[PDB]
Structure 1
Amino acid sequence: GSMKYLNVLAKALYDNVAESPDELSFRKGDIMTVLERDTQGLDGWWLCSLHGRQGIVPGNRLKILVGMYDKKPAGSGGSGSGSEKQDSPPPKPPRTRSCL
């Protein structure tokens, strides 16, 4: 094949609890690799690789991080911080696989 992904990175600006098996669950601060945007024809959903698996995430809760590709492996990590907030994130966009 002669196709290539963006391979740009992204950061979770908010948390998200996945409901669908294709959907990626993540916390605010998580870093994921974005393969493509508007994946599967789903408006606002980006194909990402996170926790070693691929799936989709709502772009409304994410920020693209651009940069050069490294020739050395990444070493991301984090910790389960408690959350003292009522501040709620924006909704995830529709998951309609065709039309509206």
Structure 2
Amino acid sequence: XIPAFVKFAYVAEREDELSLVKGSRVTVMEKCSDGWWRGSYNGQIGWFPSNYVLEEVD
């Protein structure tokens, strides 16, 4: 599975979305061609807009 870093804060707006905390690491489980990604953070799973994060370049 694929890690990404939160560049911008995101407050979940629907119950199946994941709130993103600026500076944290999320695990991306799934990508959609429309730019919504599904991932996990701190025991929570859900959808977020991909342009709030940047995939880790290791």
For structure 2, which runs of at least 5 residues remain unmatched after alignment? Answer: none
Residues in 1 aligned to 2:42 and 2:14: alpha-carbon distance in whole angstroms: 16
With normalisation by structure 1, the TM-score equals: 0.53
Q: CA deviation at 1:60?
A: 0.9
Number of residue pairs aligned between Structure 1 and Structure 2:
58
Residues in 1 aligned to 2:24 and 2:36: alpha-carbon distance in whole angstroms: 17
Q: Which has the higher contact order (CA 8 A, sep 6+)?
A: 2
After the TM superposition, list the runs of 4 or more consecutive aligned residues in structure 1 that deviate by more than 4 angstroms.
none
With normalisation by structure 2, the TM-score equals: 0.87
Q: Percent identity?
A: 40
For structure 1, which runs of at least 5 residues remain unmatched after alignment? Answer: 1-6, 68-100
Letter in 2 for 1:17: V
